[PDB]
Amino acid sequence: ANSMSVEAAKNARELLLKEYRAVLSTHSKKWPGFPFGSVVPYCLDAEGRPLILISRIAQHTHNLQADPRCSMLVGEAVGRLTLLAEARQLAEEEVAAAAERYYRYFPESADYHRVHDFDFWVLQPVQWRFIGGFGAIHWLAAERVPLANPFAGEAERGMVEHMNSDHAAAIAHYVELAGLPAHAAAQLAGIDTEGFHLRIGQGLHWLPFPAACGNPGAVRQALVQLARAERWPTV
Amino acid sequence: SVEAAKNARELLLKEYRAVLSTHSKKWPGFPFGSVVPYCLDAEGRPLILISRIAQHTHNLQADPRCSMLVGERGAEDIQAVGRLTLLAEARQLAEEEVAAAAERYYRYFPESADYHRVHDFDFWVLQPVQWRFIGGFGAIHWLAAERVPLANPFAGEAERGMVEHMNSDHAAAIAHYVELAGLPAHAAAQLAGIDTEGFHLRIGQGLHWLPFPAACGNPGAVRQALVQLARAERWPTV
Ligand SMILES: [Cl-]
Ligand SMILES: [Cl-]
Ligand SMILES: [Cl-]
Structure with missing residues (x-):
């Protein structure tokens, strides 16, 4: 399309x-x-x-x-x-x-x-x-x-707050799996269709979903899949 | 200012x-x-x-x-x-x-x-x-x-000599600067250069500046500062 570009x-x-x-x-x-x-x-x-x-x-x-x-x-x-x-x-x-x-x-x-x-x-x-x-x-x-990020704003904020409040264990799993810095526990900062940001101290990092996620339910599914994974899935 | x-x-x-x-x-x-x-x-x-x-x-x-x-x-x-x-x-x-x-x-x-x-x-x-x-x-x-x-009054042949001699003769003092300071330890640091206020170590990709306790205007003053850092148990106040 050209494919390289x-x-x-x-x-x-x-x-x-x-x-x-x-x-x-x-x-x-x-x-x-x-x-x-x-x-x-x-x-x-x-x-x-x-x-x-x-x-x-x-x-x-x-x-x-x-x-x-x-x-x-x-x-x-x-x-x-x-x-x-x-x-x-x-x-x-x-x-x-x-x-x-x-x-x-x-x-x-x-x-x-x-x-x-x-x-x-x-x-x-x-x-x-x-x-x-x-x-x-x-x-x-x-x-x-x-x-474009269709989550930006309210959908995103609710997703991030629920993850930080109720799924700190899963957040620890992401850090472990990706080999991110561990001097402080991570928090989600934001979510886009392709992945999500974690803040660790001072301290921002991006992680990809296994595939693009166009709605909050697809984001839920990816995050659950990531929390159960034993290595980071590709693509 | x-x-x-x-x-x-x-x-x-x-x-x-x-x-x-x-x-x-x-x-x-x-x-x-x-x-x-x-x-x-x-x-x-x-x-x-x-x-x-x-x-x-x-x-x-x-x-x-x-x-x-x-x-x-x-x-x-x-x-x-x-x-x-x-x-x-x-x-x-x-x-x-x-x-x-x-x-x-x-x-x-x-x-x-x-x-x-x-x-x-x-x-x-x-x-x-x-x-x-x-x-x-x-x-x-x-x-x-x-x-x-x-300005660096050592730049060139004075410096090249001081650096070449520290690297050949005083590998032990160099390893100690590394310990005292920071500082990556897989290699084997080499002096890169020296100025009136301090000196550079390369490790190995990899450049690091370290200060002398006080500015050294001549090679006799730099030898002194480098001897003191070699015998130093902790990095001294500048
Ligand atoms: Cl311009
Ligand atoms: Cl700036
Ligand atoms: Cl400014």
Whole structure:
């Protein structure tokens, strides 16, 4: 379709899901003519696009205010993904839903958008470049990489809260099976059609379902299957 | 500020991979990041070795103004550590500068040896224009071009000799630095280089900076600091 490039797009998205830290490159406003590298944590919004919470006094915020064009570099050796994007600050109506998902990924950030001078921005894709550990270069159109999350919001929140409240034992099984860090017990942070995030201390990790899950019942089935598994199933 | 400049240089010394952002030629108006290894030159500036066919090389050729981002390694809360953004002008070294660059850089990155003109590669120095340092608590300091780098009076043949002799004669002192410090122990550490404030160990892929108790301006002062660390039961206060 071509098959390599469809594989590449999925691999790109998996890398995007598996990380929660990126290097943002922006045009320096304070120093015209210079690019500017900064670090940002992120999660994905309902449409599968990077969502950031950035401070009004941060260089990268001033830079995006003057010129929304930027790139994000995210790592897996080693596979690497570049996103070319136009950043947009979320309208007031968009903030509640951003905040709810972002604060689940980053609970120590809670209320920062209200009490401190932080705002949510979304990176709107213009192009992606995925390079595998073997060095195969795949340039991909804007819409090829993101995958919408039909759970984002209320369905997801109920799923995550029930898992953290009533199925901590199963969560321990996932960590064991995947060989994740065990300095603290894990909690679910979020769920998408392809997998789920666990937070472990500071500390985010993505795990794939054995197959895609389009509704909460399919998610239940995958999680039960994972909890009973003796090794991580593939595909 | 004085605190800030020192802490900035400390991070620069402690790291060996940075994110270089350049003006994109392929997609004008989008800055592109790439990961580059680096060490510091005799003047304390970043020295990189980049392929004639790499995109970031074509980018720097068309516009040498760039950013280099360094930050504490493996940080899970990435905004709870210091980060340093260097704004710089990249300059390809003249033929007269190449030998001293290769000799130091190849000590830091042995696996690269003679990639310059068996392979596609040339040495470039990042000439500082401005630094933006953010501390672990989130204080922002903008620093002048010359505020952060400190020259290394050992760079080249003095250093090469001190390092070669520590590695041949004092493997035992080196293993002890490793124990005292951190620090991976499967290999067998080698000294990579020495500066007035500290020294680098390679293990084995694998670079690590360790401070002297106080700056050492001459080779007699570095021997002293290295003897003290060898006999030290715990790492001393700086
Ligand atoms: Cl930063
Ligand atoms: Cl800043
Ligand atoms: Cl650009």
